[PDB]
Design a protein around this ligand. Structure first.
Ligand SMILES: Nc1ncnc2c1ncn2[C@@H]1O[C@H](COP(=O)(O)OP(=O)(O)NP(=O)(O)O)[C@@H](O)[C@H]1O
Ligand SMILES: Nc1ncnc2c1ncn2[C@@H]1O[C@H](COP(=O)(O)OP(=O)(O)NP(=O)(O)O)[C@@H](O)[C@H]1O
Ligand SMILES: NCCc1ccc(S(O)(O)N[C@@H](CO)C(=O)O)cc1
Ligand SMILES: NCCc1ccc(S(O)(O)N[C@@H](CO)C(=O)O)cc1
Ligand SMILES: [Mg+2]
Ligand SMILES: [Mg+2]
Ligand SMILES: [Mg+2]
Ligand SMILES: [Mg+2]
Lengths: 268, 268
């Protein structure tokens, strides 16, 4: 019989690669020591072999996928004006606004990539041929209640296309090719949100990997966009969670407590 | 004769690839139109060819360099406790503390990677063989006066080694191999700072690319580090500035105003 604290300690040392079946009759210390040795070995293997961080590696794989398929790689600011949020229709008397990490009086950590990419679509329309295809991967921030599927600091992919080819069929096709490339099964369910209207939610079981939108939408007017567009936002830690069978998304996050899903707290 | 506003407009449309020699007798509008066409062509070329963001690409090239040479890739939080900063010796009655982007009462956007990597060195010492070699690339944040060599939102590389091989000669050798790989000439000048003590500053002309440290140092005690170590921090936008001959570092930054050093504001 273990205390909750003991159970918690073993849980954090366990990994999806471990056998989780029976309760052992071994004392807590012996169980802890066994899992510590396993996790040290896992880190030694990573160090000897690839030495890549799984979140970094996924970001690189996703980057290559989109660049090879004609999408321009964007790197825009993480710190953005609060005004961008207001202009997405998220005023400060909305429940959604409560999730915003404010920085000084007028700025915030971006909770999404959409405003930045809207600006890029509008600007690039003056230079690029049809269709315009762009994407960004990077940090986004939301205040969240503690949960196994949510992080306050996470990583978003957003791709979008503007001009011709902006149909629901093409959007679903891009999503399908993308998740097929990552080896992730999914289904599409129609849903909606107040910022974008109707959406296509990309689900793995009960876990939302992405929400996708077929534009145009009325909100486009506030961003100087007047062409059809399609786009989708994906959480990289969620993609990693599914790929590696992590139960808690914290295993997939930027962290000092987990590295590639392995506890970094390997003292007794 | 141009107004300052007209001069500013042409400056932002000019690129290092442009010929800057004489004053043209053409009217401002004609000059603007010519540079607009050039910058559109530049974006069209990027879109047709590589489609990579120069800052992203540099980050990938640097990642590959360090991973191939036995350094573990770290991805740690960008949002960190203010306490980490205090424990680097930067209390709130210091001038340096004025540069910190605070987030809520107890957190900040990291101005440096050192505390996070110190934690990783201490933790990884329980698992990895000698020497322990790690690195991280990612966003860092400092309040700065407006300058051509400083950004508020920038990107740092920090590498470090711990255990054997932690000599000044090896540190300089790693730096030399690294900048030789990037095709950047530099010199080393001894200097110091109050956080780390004496440093080796990696200079390209009068521009600081990096500061490097040969440990151990007294501060190690506050971080649970008791082995020799060496390390260096580099600004990626500064490396890009030198590589591409950008006069203003804003051309190298995460931005909605510049893409690969090219103005995104291509209206008349
Ligand atoms: N706090 C978070 N932590 C991790 N990933 C997130 C978080 N919020 C959103 N995402 C991811 O970003 C994608 C697009 O964001 P968005 O459509 O705003 O999410 P959402 O509707 O708030 N999803 P959810 O919080 O699961 O109900 C989501 O499908 C997730 O994959
Ligand atoms: N505000 C900034 N913008 C861009 N790069 C920066 C900035 N601050 C630091 N760096 C880079 O990060 C490296 C390591 O940081 P650090 O040693 O703290 O810089 P520093 O001593 O403040 N340099 P400086 O501000 O040029 O006098 C520097 O050598 C730069 O290449
Ligand atoms: C803070 C914050 C959180 C989420 C969003 S979104 O618009 O991306 N997604 C919204 C859509 O309305 C949602 O799914 O709830 C904007 C700002
Ligand atoms: C804010 C802030 C800015 C810079 C630093 S450092 O320690 O990386 N470099 C210092 C060294 O003391 C410097 O060069 O001034 C810590 C915190
Ligand atoms: Mg949510
Ligand atoms: Mg959604
Ligand atoms: Mg400085
Ligand atoms: Mg320095």
């Amino acid at each position: 019989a273990l205390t909750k604290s003991q159970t918690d300690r073993l849980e954090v040392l366990l990994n999806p690669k471990d056998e989780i079946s029976l309760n052992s009759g071994k004392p807590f210390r012996e169980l802890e020591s066994e899992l510590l040795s396993r996790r040290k070995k896992d880190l030694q293997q990573i160090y000897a072999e690839e030495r890549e961080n799984y979140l970094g590696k996924l970001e690189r794989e996703i980057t290559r996928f989109f660049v090879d398929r004609g999408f321009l790689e964007i790197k825009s600011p993480i710190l953005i004006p609060l005004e961008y949020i207001e202009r997405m229709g998220i005023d400060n008397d909305t429940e959604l606004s409560k999730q915003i990490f404010r920085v000084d009086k007028n700025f915030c950590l971006r909770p999404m990539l959409a405003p930045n990419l809207a600006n890029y679509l509008r600007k690039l329309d003056r230079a690029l041929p049809d269709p315009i295809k762009i994407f960004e991967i990077g940090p986004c921030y939301r205040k969240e209640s503690d949960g196994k599927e949510h992080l306050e600091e996470f990583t978003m992919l957003n791709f979008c296309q503007m001009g011709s080819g902006c149909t629901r069929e093409n959007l679903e096709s891009i999503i399908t090719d993308f998740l097929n490339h990552l080896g992730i099964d999914f289904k599409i369910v129609g849903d909606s949100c107040m910022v974008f209207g109707d959406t296509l939610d990309v689900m793995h079981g009960d876990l939302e990997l992405s929400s996708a939108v077929v534009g145009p939408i009325p909100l486009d007017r506030e961003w100087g966009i007047d062409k059809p567009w399609i786009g989708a936002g994906f959480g990289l830690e969620r993609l990693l969670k599914v790929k590696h069978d992590f139960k808690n998304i914290k295993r997939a996050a930027r962290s000092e407590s987990y590295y590639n899903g392995i506890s970094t707290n390997l003292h007794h």
